[PDB]
Tab-separated table of C-alpha atoms and ligand atoms in Angstrom:
chain	number	residue	atom	x	y	z
A	1	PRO	CA	-1.361	-21.427	1.708
A	2	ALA	CA	0.897	-21.917	4.764
A	3	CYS	CA	3.989	-19.985	3.584
A	4	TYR	CA	5.461	-18.272	0.512
A	5	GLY	CA	8.941	-17.942	-0.974
A	6	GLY	CA	8.716	-14.272	-1.912
A	7	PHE	CA	6.756	-11.131	-1.159
A	8	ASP	CA	5.442	-8.312	-3.346
A	9	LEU	CA	4.788	-5.042	-1.484
A	10	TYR	CA	2.078	-2.727	-2.797
A	11	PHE	CA	2.098	0.823	-1.450
A	12	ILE	CA	-1.202	2.568	-2.167
A	13	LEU	CA	-0.630	6.203	-1.228
A	14	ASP	CA	-3.376	8.795	-0.663
A	15	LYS	CA	-2.292	12.045	-2.316
A	16	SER	CA	-5.709	13.722	-2.100
A	17	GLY	CA	-6.300	17.264	-0.886
A	18	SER	CA	-7.126	16.231	2.660
A	19	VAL	CA	-3.598	14.829	3.316
A	20	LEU	CA	-1.690	17.925	2.098
A	21	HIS	CA	0.109	18.742	5.370
A	22	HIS	CA	0.824	15.036	5.939
A	23	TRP	CA	2.472	13.891	2.702
A	24	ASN	CA	5.878	13.946	4.392
A	25	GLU	CA	4.679	11.408	6.966
A	26	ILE	CA	3.384	9.198	4.156
A	27	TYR	CA	6.615	9.547	2.196
A	28	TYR	CA	8.783	8.747	5.194
A	29	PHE	CA	6.937	5.574	6.126
A	30	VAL	CA	7.274	4.352	2.535
A	31	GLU	CA	10.929	5.342	2.410
A	32	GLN	CA	11.769	3.520	5.661
A	33	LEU	CA	10.021	0.304	4.623
A	34	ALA	CA	11.287	0.414	1.027
A	35	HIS	CA	14.833	0.153	2.391
A	36	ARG	CA	14.341	-2.882	4.639
A	37	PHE	CA	15.466	-6.357	3.582
A	38	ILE	CA	12.252	-8.301	4.372
A	39	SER	CA	12.915	-11.189	1.980
A	40	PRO	CA	15.533	-12.452	-0.489
A	41	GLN	CA	12.769	-12.206	-3.109
A	42	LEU	CA	11.384	-8.753	-2.399
A	43	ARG	CA	9.608	-6.711	-5.054
A	44	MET	CA	7.576	-3.562	-4.475
A	45	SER	CA	5.307	-1.149	-6.350
A	46	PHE	CA	4.365	2.490	-5.707
A	47	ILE	CA	0.738	3.423	-6.381
A	48	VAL	CA	-0.646	6.944	-5.840
A	49	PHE	CA	-4.267	8.050	-5.959
A	50	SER	CA	-6.319	11.201	-5.812
A	51	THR	CA	-8.678	12.031	-8.690
A	52	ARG	CA	-7.524	8.781	-10.351
A	53	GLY	CA	-5.309	5.852	-9.303
A	54	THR	CA	-1.912	5.608	-10.976
A	55	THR	CA	0.888	3.023	-10.803
A	56	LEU	CA	3.846	5.353	-10.308
A	57	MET	CA	6.374	2.491	-10.238
A	58	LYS	CA	5.514	-1.002	-11.507
A	59	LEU	CA	6.488	-3.975	-9.317
A	60	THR	CA	10.268	-4.281	-9.253
A	61	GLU	CA	13.149	-5.667	-7.224
A	62	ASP	CA	15.664	-3.194	-8.691
A	63	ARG	CA	17.062	-0.729	-6.151
A	64	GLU	CA	17.787	1.998	-8.698
A	65	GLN	CA	14.178	1.957	-9.921
A	66	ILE	CA	12.985	2.042	-6.300
A	67	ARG	CA	15.359	4.968	-5.679
A	68	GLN	CA	13.956	6.886	-8.641
A	69	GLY	CA	10.426	6.029	-7.514
A	70	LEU	CA	11.146	7.505	-4.106
A	71	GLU	CA	12.342	10.637	-5.935
A	72	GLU	CA	9.045	10.986	-7.752
A	73	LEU	CA	7.284	10.517	-4.421
A	74	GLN	CA	9.244	13.466	-2.988
A	75	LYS	CA	7.756	15.636	-5.761
A	76	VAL	CA	4.130	14.867	-4.927
A	77	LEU	CA	1.813	17.834	-4.225
A	78	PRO	CA	-1.398	16.543	-2.604
A	79	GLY	CA	-4.706	17.692	-4.013
A	80	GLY	CA	-7.941	16.486	-5.572
A	81	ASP	CA	-10.590	13.895	-4.717
A	82	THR	CA	-9.869	10.600	-2.909
A	83	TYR	CA	-10.406	7.710	-5.378
A	84	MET	CA	-8.833	4.998	-3.224
A	85	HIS	CA	-10.714	2.234	-5.093
A	86	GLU	CA	-8.600	2.867	-8.207
A	87	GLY	CA	-5.452	2.601	-6.102
A	88	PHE	CA	-6.542	-0.919	-5.186
A	89	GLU	CA	-7.480	-1.572	-8.818
A	90	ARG	CA	-3.870	-0.751	-9.748
A	91	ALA	CA	-2.493	-3.247	-7.223
A	92	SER	CA	-5.030	-5.973	-8.097
A	93	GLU	CA	-4.115	-5.721	-11.771
A	94	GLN	CA	-0.432	-6.272	-11.015
A	95	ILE	CA	-1.266	-9.079	-8.591
A	96	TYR	CA	-3.415	-11.046	-11.042
A	97	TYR	CA	-0.814	-10.600	-13.769
A	98	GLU	CA	1.972	-11.981	-11.553
A	99	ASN	CA	0.049	-15.074	-10.466
A	100	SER	CA	-0.947	-15.508	-14.120
A	101	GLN	CA	2.718	-15.882	-14.973
A	102	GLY	CA	4.582	-18.674	-13.233
A	103	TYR	CA	4.951	-16.480	-10.141
A	104	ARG	CA	3.809	-17.647	-6.712
A	105	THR	CA	4.487	-14.794	-4.336
A	106	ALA	CA	2.679	-13.370	-1.370
A	107	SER	CA	0.978	-10.023	-1.960
A	108	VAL	CA	1.087	-7.350	0.750
A	109	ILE	CA	-0.793	-4.083	0.240
A	110	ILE	CA	0.048	-1.100	2.450
A	111	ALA	CA	-2.572	1.622	2.090
A	112	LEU	CA	-1.687	4.985	3.666
A	113	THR	CA	-4.612	7.399	4.047
A	114	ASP	CA	-6.551	9.704	6.392
A	115	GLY	CA	-9.656	7.570	5.863
A	116	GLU	CA	-11.657	10.667	4.894
A	117	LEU	CA	-13.922	9.087	2.270
A	118	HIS	CA	-17.472	9.870	1.239
A	119	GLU	CA	-19.726	6.838	1.565
A	120	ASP	CA	-19.705	5.963	-2.148
A	121	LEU	CA	-15.912	6.164	-2.325
A	122	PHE	CA	-15.606	4.046	0.806
A	123	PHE	CA	-18.167	1.571	-0.568
A	124	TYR	CA	-16.005	0.817	-3.609
A	125	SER	CA	-12.681	0.846	-1.753
A	126	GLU	CA	-14.046	-1.868	0.530
A	127	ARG	CA	-15.191	-3.883	-2.512
A	128	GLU	CA	-11.844	-3.538	-4.317
A	129	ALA	CA	-9.865	-4.396	-1.170
A	130	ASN	CA	-12.050	-7.495	-0.822
A	131	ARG	CA	-11.209	-8.162	-4.470
A	132	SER	CA	-7.490	-8.063	-3.569
A	133	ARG	CA	-8.045	-10.481	-0.691
A	134	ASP	CA	-9.585	-13.021	-3.082
A	135	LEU	CA	-6.422	-12.548	-5.136
A	136	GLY	CA	-4.647	-13.665	-1.951
A	137	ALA	CA	-3.407	-10.268	-0.771
A	138	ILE	CA	-2.980	-9.302	2.879
A	139	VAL	CA	-4.061	-5.688	3.391
A	140	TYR	CA	-2.720	-3.272	6.000
A	141	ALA	CA	-4.036	0.257	6.521
A	142	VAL	CA	-1.596	2.837	7.926
A	143	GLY	CA	-3.699	5.700	9.221
A	144	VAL	CA	-2.818	9.376	8.827
A	145	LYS	CA	-4.101	12.309	10.881
A	146	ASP	CA	-7.055	11.637	13.191
A	147	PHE	CA	-8.038	8.661	11.101
A	148	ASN	CA	-11.289	6.760	11.570
A	149	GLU	CA	-10.081	3.318	12.658
A	150	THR	CA	-13.543	1.744	12.296
A	151	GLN	CA	-13.504	2.453	8.557
A	152	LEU	CA	-9.855	1.373	8.102
A	153	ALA	CA	-10.586	-1.989	9.797
A	154	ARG	CA	-12.932	-2.751	6.898
A	155	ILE	CA	-10.296	-1.881	4.304
A	156	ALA	CA	-7.552	-3.759	6.155
A	157	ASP	CA	-7.975	-7.446	6.948
A	158	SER	CA	-8.786	-6.608	10.587
A	159	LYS	CA	-8.270	-4.098	13.372
A	160	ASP	CA	-4.948	-5.924	13.835
A	161	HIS	CA	-3.866	-4.550	10.456
A	162	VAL	CA	-4.495	-0.865	11.160
A	163	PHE	CA	-1.501	1.119	12.415
A	164	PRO	CA	-1.006	4.856	13.002
A	165	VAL	CA	1.563	6.409	10.676
A	166	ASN	CA	2.891	8.484	13.590
A	167	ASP	CA	4.353	5.466	15.410
A	168	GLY	CA	4.819	3.400	12.242
A	169	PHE	CA	8.400	2.363	12.908
A	170	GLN	CA	6.732	0.085	15.428
A	171	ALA	CA	4.235	-0.767	12.674
A	172	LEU	CA	6.979	-1.617	10.181
A	173	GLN	CA	8.319	-4.131	12.687
A	174	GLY	CA	4.814	-5.528	13.158
A	175	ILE	CA	4.194	-5.808	9.426
A	176	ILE	CA	7.588	-7.418	8.846
A	177	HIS	CA	6.932	-9.940	11.601
A	178	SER	CA	3.834	-11.179	9.777
A	179	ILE	CA	5.866	-11.558	6.584
A	180	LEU	CA	8.430	-13.622	8.495
A	181	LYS	CA	5.742	-15.900	9.992
A	182	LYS	CA	4.560	-16.665	6.435
A	183	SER	CA	8.100	-16.990	4.994
A	184	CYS	CA	8.984	-20.473	3.807
B	201	LIG	NA1	-8.341	11.604	1.764
Protein backbone atom coordinates (compact mmCIF):
# COMPACT_ATOMS: atom_id res chain seq x y z
CA PRO A 1 0.00 0.00 0.00
CA ALA A 2 2.18 2.88 -1.27
CA CYS A 3 -0.24 5.80 -0.72
CA TYR A 4 -3.86 6.56 0.21
CA GLY A 5 -6.44 9.13 -0.87
CA GLY A 6 -7.83 9.90 2.57
CA PHE A 7 -6.99 9.61 6.25
CA ASP A 8 -9.05 8.68 9.31
CA LEU A 9 -7.63 9.96 12.61
CA TYR A 10 -8.33 7.98 15.77
CA PHE A 11 -7.65 9.75 19.06
CA ILE A 12 -7.52 7.27 21.94
CA LEU A 13 -7.42 9.40 25.08
CA ASP A 14 -6.41 8.17 28.55
CA LYS A 15 -8.83 9.66 31.08
CA SER A 16 -7.77 7.40 33.97
CA GLY A 17 -7.02 8.59 37.48
CA SER A 18 -3.28 8.81 36.93
CA VAL A 19 -3.60 11.58 34.28
CA LEU A 20 -5.86 13.88 36.36
CA HIS A 21 -3.54 16.91 36.48
CA HIS A 22 -2.65 16.42 32.80
CA TRP A 23 -6.02 16.25 31.03
CA ASN A 24 -5.57 19.81 29.79
CA GLU A 25 -2.37 18.81 27.98
CA ILE A 26 -4.21 15.89 26.39
CA TYR A 27 -7.15 18.08 25.40
CA TYR A 28 -4.94 20.75 23.89
CA PHE A 29 -2.95 18.37 21.71
CA VAL A 30 -6.21 16.92 20.37
CA GLU A 31 -7.69 20.37 19.86
CA GLN A 32 -4.64 21.63 17.92
CA LEU A 33 -4.52 18.60 15.62
CA ALA A 34 -8.30 18.41 15.15
CA HIS A 35 -8.15 21.87 13.56
CA ARG A 36 -5.41 21.18 11.00
CA PHE A 37 -6.20 20.53 7.34
CA ILE A 38 -4.10 17.36 6.82
CA SER A 39 -6.08 16.03 3.86
CA PRO A 40 -9.03 16.93 1.62
CA GLN A 41 -10.60 13.68 2.87
CA LEU A 42 -10.04 13.98 6.60
CA ARG A 43 -12.26 12.21 9.12
CA MET A 44 -11.56 11.80 12.82
CA SER A 45 -12.95 10.02 15.89
CA PHE A 46 -12.63 10.74 19.62
CA ILE A 47 -12.22 7.71 21.88
CA VAL A 48 -11.83 7.97 25.67
CA PHE A 49 -10.93 5.21 28.10
CA SER A 50 -10.62 4.62 31.80
CA THR A 51 -12.66 1.84 33.43
CA ARG A 52 -14.06 1.06 29.95
CA GLY A 53 -13.34 2.31 26.41
CA THR A 54 -15.98 4.53 24.83
CA THR A 55 -16.32 6.08 21.36
CA LEU A 56 -17.20 9.64 22.36
CA MET A 57 -17.51 10.82 18.74
CA LYS A 58 -17.84 8.37 15.83
CA LEU A 59 -15.65 8.95 12.76
CA THR A 60 -16.78 12.12 11.00
CA GLU A 61 -15.61 14.84 8.65
CA ASP A 62 -18.20 17.35 9.91
CA ARG A 63 -16.69 20.36 11.69
CA GLU A 64 -19.74 21.02 13.86
CA GLN A 65 -19.69 17.46 15.21
CA ILE A 66 -15.94 17.78 15.83
CA ARG A 67 -16.61 21.09 17.61
CA GLN A 68 -19.21 19.49 19.86
CA GLY A 69 -16.87 16.56 20.47
CA LEU A 70 -14.17 18.95 21.62
CA GLU A 71 -16.77 20.43 24.00
CA GLU A 72 -17.44 17.05 25.57
CA LEU A 73 -13.68 16.58 25.89
CA GLN A 74 -13.47 19.84 27.87
CA LYS A 75 -15.91 18.33 30.39
CA VAL A 76 -13.82 15.24 31.12
CA LEU A 77 -12.88 14.56 34.77
CA PRO A 78 -10.11 11.93 34.87
CA GLY A 79 -10.52 8.97 37.19
CA GLY A 80 -10.72 5.19 37.31
CA ASP A 81 -8.64 2.30 35.97
CA THR A 82 -6.66 2.41 32.70
CA TYR A 83 -8.32 0.02 30.20
CA MET A 84 -6.39 1.19 27.13
CA HIS A 85 -7.07 -2.10 25.28
CA GLU A 86 -10.76 -1.19 24.97
CA GLY A 87 -9.79 2.19 23.54
CA PHE A 88 -8.02 0.34 20.75
CA GLU A 89 -10.99 -2.03 20.44
CA ARG A 90 -13.17 1.03 19.76
CA ALA A 91 -10.87 2.25 16.98
CA SER A 92 -10.41 -1.23 15.45
CA GLU A 93 -14.17 -1.69 15.24
CA GLN A 94 -14.59 1.56 13.31
CA ILE A 95 -11.60 0.72 11.11
CA TYR A 96 -12.86 -2.72 10.08
CA TYR A 97 -16.33 -1.32 9.42
CA GLU A 98 -14.96 1.40 7.11
CA ASN A 99 -12.82 -0.96 5.03
CA SER A 100 -15.82 -3.31 4.95
CA GLN A 101 -17.76 -0.60 3.15
CA GLY A 102 -16.30 0.64 -0.11
CA TYR A 103 -13.90 2.87 1.83
CA ARG A 104 -10.14 2.72 1.28
CA THR A 105 -8.61 5.19 3.69
CA ALA A 106 -5.49 5.22 5.77
CA SER A 107 -6.02 4.74 9.50
CA VAL A 108 -3.96 6.77 11.98
CA ILE A 109 -4.34 6.13 15.71
CA ILE A 110 -3.04 8.73 18.17
CA ALA A 111 -2.96 7.31 21.69
CA LEU A 112 -2.32 9.85 24.48
CA THR A 113 -1.39 8.33 27.85
CA ASP A 114 1.05 8.34 30.78
CA GLY A 115 1.92 4.71 30.02
CA GLU A 116 1.18 3.74 33.63
CA LEU A 117 -0.27 0.27 33.00
CA HIS A 118 -0.19 -2.88 35.09
CA GLU A 119 1.34 -5.78 33.18
CA ASP A 120 -1.98 -7.43 32.29
CA LEU A 121 -3.42 -4.16 30.99
CA PHE A 122 -0.26 -3.51 28.99
CA PHE A 123 -0.31 -7.09 27.68
CA TYR A 124 -3.72 -6.61 26.08
CA SER A 125 -3.09 -3.06 24.84
CA GLU A 126 -0.08 -4.37 22.93
CA ARG A 127 -2.21 -7.18 21.46
CA GLU A 128 -5.05 -4.84 20.43
CA ALA A 129 -2.63 -2.30 18.93
CA ASN A 130 -1.09 -5.15 16.94
CA ARG A 131 -4.65 -6.00 15.92
CA SER A 132 -5.05 -2.43 14.58
CA ARG A 133 -1.80 -2.72 12.63
CA ASP A 134 -3.11 -5.83 10.84
CA LEU A 135 -6.14 -3.69 10.00
CA GLY A 136 -3.58 -1.40 8.35
CA ALA A 137 -3.43 1.31 11.02
CA ILE A 138 -0.33 3.36 11.82
CA VAL A 139 -0.08 3.90 15.58
CA TYR A 140 1.52 6.87 17.33
CA ALA A 141 1.87 7.18 21.11
CA VAL A 142 1.96 10.71 22.56
CA GLY A 143 3.40 10.40 26.04
CA VAL A 144 2.15 12.32 29.07
CA LYS A 145 4.01 13.01 32.32
CA ASP A 146 7.24 11.07 32.90
CA PHE A 147 6.09 8.40 30.50
CA ASN A 148 7.90 5.10 30.03
CA GLU A 149 9.07 5.31 26.42
CA THR A 150 10.12 1.64 26.31
CA GLN A 151 6.52 0.56 26.87
CA LEU A 152 5.07 3.15 24.44
CA ALA A 153 7.43 1.94 21.67
CA ARG A 154 5.62 -1.41 21.82
CA ILE A 155 2.20 0.23 21.53
CA ALA A 156 3.33 2.59 18.77
CA ASP A 157 4.80 1.20 15.56
CA SER A 158 8.32 2.13 16.73
CA LYS A 159 10.34 4.49 18.90
CA ASP A 160 9.97 6.86 15.93
CA HIS A 161 6.25 7.05 16.70
CA VAL A 162 6.52 8.08 20.35
CA PHE A 163 6.38 11.82 21.04
CA PRO A 164 6.17 13.79 24.29
CA VAL A 165 2.91 15.71 24.67
CA ASN A 166 4.85 18.65 26.13
CA ASP A 167 6.55 19.50 22.82
CA GLY A 168 3.78 18.01 20.66
CA PHE A 169 3.39 20.96 18.33
CA GLN A 170 6.65 19.63 16.94
CA ALA A 171 5.05 16.18 17.07
CA LEU A 172 1.96 17.32 15.16
CA GLN A 173 4.26 18.50 12.38
CA GLY A 174 6.07 15.15 12.47
CA ILE A 175 2.85 13.16 12.37
CA ILE A 176 1.45 15.29 9.55
CA HIS A 177 4.64 14.84 7.55
CA SER A 178 4.16 11.06 7.58
CA ILE A 179 0.58 11.51 6.37
CA LEU A 180 1.85 13.68 3.51
CA LYS A 181 4.49 11.10 2.49
CA LYS A 182 1.69 8.52 2.17
CA SER A 183 -0.76 10.92 0.46
CA CYS A 184 -1.59 10.00 -3.12
NA1 LIG B 1 -2.97 5.79 33.13
